Structure of ATP-dependent DNA/RNA helicase DHX36:
Amino acid sequence: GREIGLWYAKKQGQKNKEAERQERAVVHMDERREEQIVQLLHSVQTDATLDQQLLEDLQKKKTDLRYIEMQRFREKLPSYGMQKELVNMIDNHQVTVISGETGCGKTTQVTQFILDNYIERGKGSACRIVCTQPRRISAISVAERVAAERAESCGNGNSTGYQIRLQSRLPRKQGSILYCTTGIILQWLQSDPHLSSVSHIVLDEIHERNLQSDVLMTVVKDLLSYRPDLKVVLMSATLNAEKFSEYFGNCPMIHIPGFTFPVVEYLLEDIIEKIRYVPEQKEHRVNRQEKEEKEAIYKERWPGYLRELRQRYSASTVDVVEMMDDEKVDLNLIAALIRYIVLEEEDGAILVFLPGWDNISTLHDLLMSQVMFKSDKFIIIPLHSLMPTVNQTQVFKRTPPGVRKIVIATNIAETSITIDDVVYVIDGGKIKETHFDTQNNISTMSAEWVSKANAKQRKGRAGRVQPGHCYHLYNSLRASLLDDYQLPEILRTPLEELCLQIKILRLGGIAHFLSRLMDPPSNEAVLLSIKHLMELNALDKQEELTPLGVHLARLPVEPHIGKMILFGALFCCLDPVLTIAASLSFKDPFVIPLGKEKVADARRKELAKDTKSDHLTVVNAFKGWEKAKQRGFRYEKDYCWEYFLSSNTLQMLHNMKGQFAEHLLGAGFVSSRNPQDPESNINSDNEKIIKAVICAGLYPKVAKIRLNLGKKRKMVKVYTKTDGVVAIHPKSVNVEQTEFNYNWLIYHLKMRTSSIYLYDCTEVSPYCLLFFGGDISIQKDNDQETIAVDEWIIFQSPARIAHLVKELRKELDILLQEKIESPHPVDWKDTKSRDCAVLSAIIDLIKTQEKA
RNA sequence: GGGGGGGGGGGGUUGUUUUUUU
């Protein structure tokens, strides 16, 4: 049996081991370079008026026609009725929590209330309000809205403005309101730990528990003792908002009623009864913690619910409800519901919430496989971040009464995009969210049930301009068993960047600060992050910042990308390394449409050329886009269209590169703020040096390619040390690649969706891993001499060459430590650049190919 | 693990949530 399997598995294993031992790469250098290396080693080794002005300005503006119209509009908001109570509550208490529903307008009214109250009281110069938003577009839009409501332009020294990354319309210093993302305040804390200039701090959308919001809340709570005059206003979504008050010592709470049109809720049984749905899928027919305790409850009440359901509904409805499955979204039911709505429901747009791209594509194909949806009376817009959302401006445009608009979207339409026309919302109760597994140090993505807050937000997405309907694709039991809120990001993401930020802000011990957070992370995650930072030489054995750790913490990227940036500056390949770092920190510039998917992969592979790297193809795309932009705006548009590239993402990457170069110039690694200065880009034309720098940055993420060849279409397998067998994601340019120069891949993103996937892999060379990898050991295996990196990356090499490489690495680490502790551009004149020069020479003109 | 057998169908090439940095 299982033992019979062994009698052939043991034979199979030996073959794989022998094949791995056969093709093992040979590290060999010519006689001239060996003599040069030994010679080099031997040589080296031996005011009062401002208040009056503001008050008079307000009094004069009170007579403006535009201001009068804006006031008439503002009076309709529910917050206008509670203006006085809000002002008194904020004035009399240090910390207040404001709970409001959708449409209450608290975001654009509370700050105006405080500012106006201070201005009319004759102390307008003491008002400096900062309101933090979770999104850049949200902050920009709110700032423009507040500026419009005040009959003024945003920024330009006026009373309101915004500041986000690489963009700021700053208002006047005193008597102003600033709308910024949450990271801006954390950056301010680096130079101003007390926020002395800030008089009022307003934290928005605290119910969305992201990293920055929680960190800022903890920092403000700690800082309140040192700033008795600071006033904090927390604004939430009136569901589990008492917990925020509890965190701040039972601070006073105030509720602002919402203003929305009524929305009718339909559940799965109601939908099936109403549309008389009959499923044809019958013919065509590893856990966590509380999940498994909610499912126990679902299965104990299922028999009793089906019964209670049999009384309220017909037999067919109960049969369909019972036979429906979980872990999937019934797209046929969604299509039937859409057909029902477009046949005998009133006019209005339909918004469909789906968990992923594949479901959106399947629903789109299902919809236009029918005759009625292929006419000009229907417009179907898929919404997803990877689609050309910048091109998707047709979602906002209204439609004539004879044509209906159907929007199939992910949760991007929950917050980022507002259609303001939707009448019917079809909520598939599945949402894809990312969890971190600290046991295996692997990120996991799966489609989980939507939370109660998510369902409420989706329902409120309808009924903004007229009464609407919401269809939830889950029964009553599932609805009653939903989670109140999604797990906060403190419990789903790695904490290395957070640990570095904690250290750079002098907030105390990492564990001590993290334990004071709302729903603090587990001790295992903290220990893993601290150990990871220690192994990167970013923290000493006493949990303090190393000289490299300071530079990593001051860079707006996670530590591995920061190390890659520093090494690219050191080795004079600044431009491609900065482009790769910007792409890895924020998105790849590639967008795909709904239908033309394989064409996008073909164009990406055409861009990749023979680099066999998912990061050098981004460099090629950026270079081509820059050339097209130089040659013309129209040609830039054609290039972006033909190669399926996002112009906005490319511009943002360019700005991020400029910011990185500015920081590098400030620190002292480079002599200019231009990433394309020739003095810092002498090795930028050599792909081997760029790959070596990539390996130096994100080293420990290595993978081994085993070319078993044989007759299984000469297919390749990918292995990882900590994990087991992994696969290359189809989005990569190496998924179908079978002619690899070297059997080693370096990657950045690795996630487990259904199988462990590598989303961006770059082919790497033996010397890149030798000089920029783990510990080097020299030993003998059977009948050949080997040199190993981390005792699992083995290369063939004679003992003399291996000892030379080990000594060279021992010297290079010291050289890099001195170059990092005291940054300075490297002068390439035979003083101490000899080690770097010979390493560059070895990487450039030694490695040729494998032996397979 | 393979195409050592059809001793089983114990394992078998199975696509991309959203966001943020003086």
